[PDB]
């Protein structure tokens, strides 16, 4: 029951300001301080200090001492992070930790948020719909796609039918590749259910896109 | 290093697993602790770990988790490890130097459980869609599921023989019980139509499986 929430992932060019924030339930959020720990790519965790939700005192490690805040709205029980004049190297993900519990420093974590520091632009996602060429042969399974191609950053959603067909699906986690990312779902139906129904995909990428296309016969 | 760990280590599913964190002289009695981390969850906080062995462990852990310890070496034990327990192990330490605390966490071990039972994976392939071809791009879909362990290789292949400019995911969901995986290659519209076939070739812990596409089809 104890839980820490985070907000979604971050896309900022460099020079730019962040805040993230952490949502606690399951305890009293006054009682035990919030830290945050930094996970950049390739590297391991770096704790960066932590912020006493009663007294509302932050305590920070040398390494983000001058363009970091912790801060909090205890009436809702959440703590922010702030970072400011956002540089290359603060691209990371951000953990908030709370401790115990016997002098515990790090007994539950939330989920972390991505913050990206790039120049690179939001790039909202070309989708194509992947049917068979006509109906299939009498008695068979088909298996129809959609192609999500080329967008920054993560992530999409992809439903079908507007989540109401799921016993097809399998959607695969994305691919990287020049800067840009790549996905596909795919949904096996029977012969006899496509195309006499409708079979659509719906893409959501929330930045602030979505897109719906039927799938229909080439 | 204040906390050495090797970045990586490997153990039998159902034997034995025994993972090494070591503290520096200077905090070689020091109690350290052991969190797991794992892809899109929180890290999880595993255990506290004493210099005598004396350990108590966390919400959530199963009794498989034990630990122990000899001179500046704490060892995470996992009785019959499990794919489940596959994840980053990372051992951390508190400390204070002048008035002020300090918390290091080592580099973490990336463990994984081998001799798993193989399930063999599935692949469906789609072609480039009417839509694609006339912007005159041609993206050749390759999607592979239901297989364990983690973990494929993927190659194209032109009219049988192999190529580069199309890359794939890490191989995962670690839920349900199986895994999930997808390639791309990025074509123009005037390369799909002017081979006889392309080909997508998945290795799994070293079988292959193949499927094609051919132009001429559609």
């Known amino acids: 029951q104890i839980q820490l929430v985070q907000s979604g992932p971050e896309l900022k060019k460099p020079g730019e300001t962040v805040k993230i924030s952490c949502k606690a339930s399951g305890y009293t959020f006054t009682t035990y301080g919030m830290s945050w720990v930094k996970q950049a790519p390739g590297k391991g965790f770096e704790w960066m200090g932590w912020?006493?939700?009663?007294?509302?005192?932050?305590t920070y490690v040398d390494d983000f001492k001058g363009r970091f805040a912790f801060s909090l709205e205890t009436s809702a029980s959440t703590a922010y992070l702030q970072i400011n004049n956002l540089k290359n190297e603060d691209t990371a993900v951000y953990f908030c930790?709370?401790?115990?519990?016997?002098?515990?420093?790090?007994?539950?974590w939330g989920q972390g948020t991505l913050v990206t520091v790039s120049a690179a632009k939001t790039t909202p996602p070309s989708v194509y719909p992947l049917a068979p060429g006509s109906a299939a042969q009498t008695n068979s399974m088909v298996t129809l796609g959609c192609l999500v191609k080329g967008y920054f950053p993560e992530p999409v959603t992809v439903t079908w039918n507007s989540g109401s067909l799921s016993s097809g699906v399998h959607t695969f986690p994305a691919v990287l590749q020049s800067d840009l990312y790549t996905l596909s779902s795919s949904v096996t139906v029977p012969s006899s259910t496509w195309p006499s129904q409708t079979v659509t995909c719906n893409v959501a990428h929330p930045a602030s896109s979505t897109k719906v296309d039927k799938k229909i016969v080439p | 290093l204040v906390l050495t760990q090797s970045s990586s280590a490997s153990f039998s599913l159902g034997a034995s697993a025994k993972l090494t964190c070591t503290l520096n002289?200077?905090?070689?009695?020091?109690?350290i602790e052991w969190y797991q981390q794992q892809p899109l969850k929180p890290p999880k906080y595993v255990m506290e770990?004493?210099?005598?062995?004396?350990?108590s462990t966390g919400d959530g852990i199963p009794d498989r988790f034990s630990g122990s310890s000899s001179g500046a070496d704490r060892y995470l034990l996992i009785s019959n490890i499990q794919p489940e327990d596959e994840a980053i192990y990372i051992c951390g330490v508190g400390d204070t130097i002048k008035e002020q605390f300090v918390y290091v966490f080592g580099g973490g071990t990336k463990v994984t459980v081998l001799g798993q039972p193989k399930s063999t994976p599935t692949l469906t392939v789609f072609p480039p869609s009417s839509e694609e071809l006339k912007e005159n791009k041609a993206t050749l879909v390759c999607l592979i599921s239901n297989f364990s362990p983690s973990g494929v290789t993927v190659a194209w292949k032109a009219n049988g023989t192999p190529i580069t400019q199309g890359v794939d995911t890490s191989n995962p969901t670690k839920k349900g019980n199986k895994f999930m995986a997808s390639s791309f290659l990025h074509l123009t519209s005037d390369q799909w139509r002017s081979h006889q076939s392309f080909t997508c070739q998945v290795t799994h812990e070293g079988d292959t499986v193949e499927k094609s596409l051919s132009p001429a089809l559609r």
């Open positions: 002289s200077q905090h070689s009695t020091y109690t």
């Open positions: 930790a709370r401790g115990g519990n016997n002098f515990l420093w790090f007994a539950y």
């Open positions: 912020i006493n939700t009663y007294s509302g005192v932050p």
């Open positions: 770990l004493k210099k005598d062995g004396s350990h």
